[PDB]
Each structure stands twice: as structure tokens, then as C-alpha cells.
Design a protein around this nucleic acid. Structure first.
Ligand SMILES: [Ca+2]
Ligand SMILES: [Ca+2]
Ligand SMILES: [K+]
Ligand SMILES: [K+]
Lengths: 307, 322
DNA sequence: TGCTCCCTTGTCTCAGT
DNA sequence: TCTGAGACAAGGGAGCT
């Protein structure tokens, strides 16, 4: 995601009762689930099979509210994202195969994005293969995503609904703005600028319109001492802070590389509608028995009301 | 003062009403008044309004006399070298001076003027050999005064106590601090405080990056002193097994010290810092101060001359006070 | 290879002391 | 060359007048 972006976007959120989600097709961004379950479920070191337990719980929550989910997994890691993150617990191919086997037995379709899952999710919604995106990753907006359902897996009666239109109307931010805002705040595709947090990054986009103007202002004022004498409080304070943080803004700011990565992510344009099956009780018993030692009786009480 | 020391000491404070101070002899640390007035009282343009030192000293004298306090004013003499060097570093640092690799003045005339003003009020004053706070502590110790009025936390490090803080905020009360309440409630004595300053910073030392009020207090409490703290840092340096057997406090503290690239060298703790606070240059004279009565005729003309106040304007304020 | 929340700290600026 | 409070931001660790 973009650092601090959820705080910025938060006040545009609207609460949606889960029951309204019945029969809705939702793209589910599952890209980091296995890793998170690994880190978050431990003992008195990581619990074995937390990926099975974790997926099972959430799949159940989705089906309980009659959501039709399509799961999305990461393909590869884009170069810009490697380079950025290039500045104990591992996700094995088995873990992935297992949760995928689990989804198939639930009758739930899944895909592996060519690259980032959030990017693929936005694509699914653009092609009308889904009606909404379930994700907690704020990168999704920069990839074109709207109709975002955040906090699906907190224990709450509701979920937070975000859309690009509300962001545009309430914060003045369009997609290009959010992409430029990322280069102040930081994201997986850029380190942003040291000293620029949610308050001043928003002020910069609002006062300067775009990073080109912001940079020209910065560079021009550094050159011409007379231009500085006319500067207001916002500019004067901002200038000092940037120089103190050793900020240099050159030819590669804003980044065309960063702009491309968000505007043209590698995605699958396939328009085949997803197929939702039914949970297979017999195969789900044997799966939970094999993997967790759940007696069929135990799977039954949970699964039978869901079918 | 010591950075953040008032945040640390604050909760041991006792709120005290001015009327409880009637007839008390109070040392007044006036060492930065003129400068503060110069900086805090400004033009619509942005300049210092002329003679704010006279206006400032005047209003504060009136508050003291109003509550029947018998003040003796204490001014700085020299500036100790250690204090001099650190202050220029802070000045340059905040002007923007890069410190590592990439990735309005007070004139003798102003002093003479506020001193003539005190004399015409009948109020005694002295000039300390060096720091005014240290001389204030010595006056109390010698029973030449009953309390100390200052906002500078260094006073405790110079052995002061019975400190009346925020006397000149525009408020209905004042905050009282003393050495014993601090020792009882915080476990801090004079030597502890002198070592805290080397973590937190003061006019005599830069302190350690990453050490704020919370961590500094914990270091003093957990290690007792800076020698033990330095010894602990140095002995668990490359013992990877001992570092596993360090509790949470030590483990986190070691990592923070490492992250902040902290070096504790042979001058840590500092003998020189210890001496500046323990043995400051003070005047041990035991002669009692003499309080006089305010001279209306001389105050009238003084205010006339320095501020253009008509006599009746001075009378309206001074007469009820007299 | 994750996240958000909370705690602590650094830095700066305006108004007051 | 001041003080004091507040706003903003960086970073770490725990637990999911
Ligand atoms: Ca992402
Ligand atoms: Ca001092
Ligand atoms: K930033
Ligand atoms: K410090």
C-alpha cells in the first residue's frame, strides 16, 4: 500500500452491512494471507497449518454472508517492487497448493495474477467479472481500483466501503494525484520523501497541483534568493524542512517508471466469467481430517449450515 | 537547563498560591529576562519594541511587590566555557549546519538600566560570579533567602531546592519543587540529576541521541549510574549468548544504542561536567540583603525618562503598591 | 515478504513566560 | 542567546513566560 493512505482516505469510508453483500461477486486479494497467518499465529514459533486454519475461517465468513468470491494470488514481483523492498518463515509452494486445493473443494474459483494481485483485482472489476474488491492494500486505488471493501476480516457486523468517486469528491484526488502522492508518502514502488507525511503531502498536491510544479518551485527558490522573500508560511516552512532532510529533486522526479508501474501493471485481460461451484462436503471432511485431524463430525457442524 | 527535566519533575510539583508568599525572601534568577523580553515583545513589523526590558522588569517587579515578596535579583556574571561552546553548536545546528555525512543583543546599558530600576524600587541585587542559578542555590543554602524564583532546571543540579517555577506566567498560582520530594518520589538526587543531564542534554553537554525522558530515567533507575551503564554496554558488545540472556529492557536499550550509532567513550561520564555542576563558582558572602522602600519621586522621573510616562501615570500604579 | 497500534523521540514554529 | 506547547513525522516493538 501507500504509507498513511488509509488514514487520508478513512473519512471517505462508508459502513456496509455484511448482509447486503449477499450474492455479490467479490475479488479477494489473498496475496499475503499465507505469510500473515504464519507470522500472526504462533505458540509458546509458528503454528503448523495456520494457512489451512486461516483460509478456512475466512472462506466460511464469506460464504455465511452469501458472497461469491474469486481468490487472487500474486504471480511474480515487479522489478520496481523488488528494488524498493531491497532497501525465518517462508511461503512454500505446498502451502499455496494446499489452500488452492481447499478453495477448489469449496467450489470457489481462484486465479494467479501475472504479477501483483491488487492490480489483477482492479482489472477483474474493470472487466465486470466481479462486483467489488475485498482487500486491505491501499495500492489497489493506484491500480485503478474502486468499490473497495476494507476490514472484511475484523470481527465486526460491517465492512468499510471505499470508492474512487468519494475520494475524488471529498479529497480532490484522482488517480494521477494518488500516484504522485505515493512518491511523497512512500509505497512498495518508491521510497517517497523523508519528512513528508500525510499532512504535508496532501498540502503539496493541493497547493502545487502536481510534482512537476512542486519541484520547479523547490528548485527555482533554491536558486533565486529573491523568490524566497515573497514566500508564504506554507512554502517557507516546507522549503526549510526539505533542505534539512537533504531533499534533491532532479530529472527523474516525478518517476515515469513509478507512473508506468501503476498505470500499466502487468495483468491478465481474460474475460471468461468465473464459475462458482458448491462446497463439497465429502471432500471437505477428508481434507480437514487429513490436514488438521478434524473428525468429520467437527467439520459437519461448521459446514452443513453453510451449504 | 536539562532538556525535558521539567517534564520528569512536573508530577512532584505542588501548586502554591501567591498570597502564601507574603514576606518571604526570594532569590530571583533574572539572568535571561532582558533577552526574553527582546525576543518575546515584538513590532507589528517584526522588530523588538524599544525598552521592553524596562517595561518587562517593571511589570514583574510589581507582581512581586503586590504579593509582598522581598526579592533579591541575581544576574549572570561570566559564561563558563563548557556552556559557551555548546550554545554555539546549538545555534549553528539549527541554522542548518550539516553535522555528519549525507544520507537583538543584550547591552551593558540595558543591564545598567534595569539595575537602576531595581535600586529605585528599593530592591537589592547581585551579580553572580558565573551562573545565576548556582548563586541562587548558594543564597538559599546560606539562609539569605527562603526560596528561589527561577524557571531553569539547572538550579537543582547546582544544589538548589525550594524552587518556585512559572512565577511570571500570567496565572493565579505558582509551582513549588524541592529536592526531598524529588528524591522520595523519583529516586533522583543531585548526582543522579547531574548524570541525567548527560543522557538528556543541557548547556553543559549534548546528551545522547535517542535518549528522551522515558529512557533516560530508566537507565538511571536500572543501572544506578553512568559507569555501570557504560560497563554493561561494553561487556555485552560481542557476547551473542549473553545478549539472548538480556531481559527486554536491556535488549531493547542495546538495540536502540546500536541503531543510534551511540559511542560511549573515555569521557563518559564526564569529570568536567560533574565539576561544572558540583563546584560552580559562587560567592559565599554571608551578609544579609537590605530591602528598601520604593522611591516614588525617583521612579516617576525614571519612567518619564525611559518610557515617557507622565508622573500621574506612574502614580496610578506605584502609589497603591507603596 | 505483513500489518496496525502504541510508545518514544526529534524537529520545528508560534505565542508567551 | 529563551520558554513551552503542540503539530508532524520517523522508527521500533507487540500482538494480530
Ligand atoms: Ca501491494
Ligand atoms: Ca542555566
Ligand atoms: K515520507
Ligand atoms: K537527547
Amino acid at each position: 500500500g501507500v504509507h498513511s493512505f488509509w488514514d487520508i482516505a478513512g473519512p471517505t469510508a462508508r459502513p456496509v452491512r455484511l448482509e447486503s453483500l449477499e450474492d455479490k461477486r467479490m475479488a479477494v486479494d489473498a496475496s499475503i494471507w499465507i505469510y500473515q497467518f504464519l507470522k500472526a499465529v504462533r505458540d509458546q514459533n509458528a503454528v503448523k497449518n495456520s494457512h489451512i486454519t486461516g483460509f478456512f475461517r475466512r472462506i466460511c465468513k464469506l460464504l455465511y454472508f452469501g458472497i461469491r468470491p474469486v481468490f487472487v494470488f500474486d504471480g511474480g514481483v515487479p522489478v520496481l517492487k523488488r528494488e524498493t523492498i531491497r532497501q525465518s518463515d517462508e511461503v512454500t509452494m505446498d502451502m499455496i497448493k494446499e489452500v488452492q486445493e481447499l478453495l477448489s473443494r469449496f467450489g470457489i474459483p481462484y486465479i494467479t495474477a501475472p504479477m501483483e494481485a491488487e492490480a489483477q483485482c482492479a482489472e477483474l472489476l474493470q472487466l465486470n467479472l466481479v462486483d467489488g474488491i475485498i482487500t486491505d492494500d491501499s495500492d489497489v486505488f493506484l491500480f485503478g481500483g474502486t468499490k473497495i471493501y476494507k476490514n472484511m476480516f475484523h470481527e465486526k457486523n460491517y465492512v468499510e466501503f471505499y470508492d474512487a468517486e468519494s475520494i475524488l469528491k471529498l479529497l480532490g484526488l484522482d488517480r494521477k494525484n494518488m500516484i504522485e502522492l505515493a512518491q511523497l508518502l512512500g509505497s512498495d514502488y518508491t521510497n517517497g520523501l523523508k519528512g513528508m507525511g500525510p499532512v504535508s503531502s496532501i498540502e503539496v498536491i493541493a497547493e502545487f497541483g502536481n510534482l512537476k510544479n512542486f519541484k520547479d518551485w523547490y528548485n527555482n527558490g533554491q536558486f533565486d534568493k529573491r523568490k524566497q522573500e515573497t514566500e508564504n508560511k506554507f512554502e517557507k516552512d516546507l522549503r526549510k524542512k526539505l533542505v534539512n532532510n537533504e531533499i534533491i529533486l532532479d530529472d527523474d522526479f516525478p518517476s515515469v517508471m513509478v507512473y508506468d508501474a501503476y498505470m500499466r501493471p502487468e495483468v491478465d485481460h481474460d474475460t471468461t466469467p468465473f464459475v462458482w461451484g458448491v462446497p463439497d462436503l465429502d471432500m471437505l471432511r477428508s481434507f480437514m481430517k487429513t490436514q488438521l485431524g478434524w473428525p468429520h463430525e467437527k467439520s459437519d457442524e461448521i459446514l452443513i449450515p453453510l451449504i
